[PDB]
């Protein structure tokens, strides 16, 4: 029944994947309100669709900055994957378009802010609070991996809490459709799997190690490997020595010792039972997977929203006038966008 759902999901994905949606809006169809977030070659702005009065999060990428950072393929994969994906725990891409200067990805506005914001402020989540989110990530990856997609950027910053209190995974810049092994060094230092650092080839198992880093962070209030500088973080990851806070249940410690597993022949998600080694684990015993998927499970925290256009759950960022050059920039590089 899960493999039945996933087979339907695949058919739906592959059609949108082999025939991507292009130019589904124009910049003048949207009223730019506030910067919700920031990235190296763009920003996510709170936007208002005038025809509908609907609120969206529009990701604006500078084509030249994408080209400069050799992020062409990454930007193309992200739009292609997002326009083809459909899962409850993934931000819905409503529109996508491009102009002379920028690439645009109009997404569903997730008003509750990032898990990062709430996790930092609250300190740590209770094991049931982290389990609830972990479960949503578990199914999300189960979904992405069935479509042969690697996420590669899981962290609290990328997971947005929606009005119902459910996660919505954003930032698809490192998402790649791979049937086999990949070698690109990408992701966030704290979440990198040893294979990525060791510059060896890697697969989906890196998303399971990331899930491990996320569950620890959510439960501890700090990542399992931190140091003031990235190369110092990498030394702790490759070492494969994790201390667990004294409050961690034996189940959590066991789940994490399997997810944060340097040995791929032993790493949960990377074995014969695949995802079921995670799903059935003692720490997830109380989890009803179908109920999580259907959003029928009670959220441990429902965000504060003071209207459809509210941005209070998001931090303030400096704004920059969106200038659209009179000449088409990097046109051929982004022709399929």
């Amino acid at each position: 029944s899960v493999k039945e759902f996933l087979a339907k999901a695949k058919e739906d994905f592959l059609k949108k994947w082999e025939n991507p949606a292009q130019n589904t809006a124009h910049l003048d169809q949207f009223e730019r309100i506030k910067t919700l977030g920031t990235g190296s070659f763009g920003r996510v702005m709170l936007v208002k669709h005038m025809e509908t009065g609907n609120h969206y999060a529009m990701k604006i990428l500078d084509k030249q900055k994408v080209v400069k950072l050799k992020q062409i393929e990454h930007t193309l994969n992200e739009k292609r994957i997002l326009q083809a994906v459909n899962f409850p725990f993934l931000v819905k891409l409503e529109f996508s378009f491009k102009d002379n200067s920028n690439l645009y990805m109009v997404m569903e506005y997730v008003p509750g802010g990032e898990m990062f914001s709430h996790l930092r402020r609250i300190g740590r989540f209770s094991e049931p609070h982290a389990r609830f989110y972990a479960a949503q990530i578990v199914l999300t990856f189960e979904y992405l991996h069935s479509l042969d997609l690697i996420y590669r950027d899981l962290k609290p910053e990328n997971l947005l809490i929606d009005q119902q209190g459910y996660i919505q995974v954003t930032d698809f810049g490192f998402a790649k459709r791979v049937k086999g092994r990949t070698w690109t060094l990408c992701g966030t230092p704290e979440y990198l799997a040893p294979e990525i650092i060791l510059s060896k080839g890697y697969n989906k198992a890196v998303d399971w190690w990331a899930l491990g880093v996320l569950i620890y962070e959510m439960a501890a209030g700090y990542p399992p490997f931190f140091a003031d500088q990235p190369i110092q973080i990498y030394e702790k990851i490759v070492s494969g020595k994790v201390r667990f806070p004294s409050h961690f249940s034996s189940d959590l410690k066991d789940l994490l010792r399997n997810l944060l597993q340097v040995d791929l022949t032993k790493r949960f998600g990377n074995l014969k039972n695949g995802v079921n080694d995670i799903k059935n684990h003692k720490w997830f015993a109380t989890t009803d997977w179908i109920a999580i998927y259907q959003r029928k499970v009670e959220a441990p925290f429902i965000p504060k929203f003071k209207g459809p256009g509210d941005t209070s759950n998001f931090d303030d960022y400096e704004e920059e006038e969106i200038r659209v050059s009179i000449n088409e920039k990097c046109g051929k590089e982004f022709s399929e966008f």
Binding site: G187, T188, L192, Y222, F226, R243
Partner: peptide, 18 residues
């Protein structure tokens, strides 16, 4: 504590991709 070390660290802010 491990928490104090994290709090005092330079990596308690929004982390960037590499």
């Amino acid at each position: 504590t491990t928490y104090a070390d994290f709090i005092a660290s330079g990596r308690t802010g929004r982390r960037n991709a590499i």
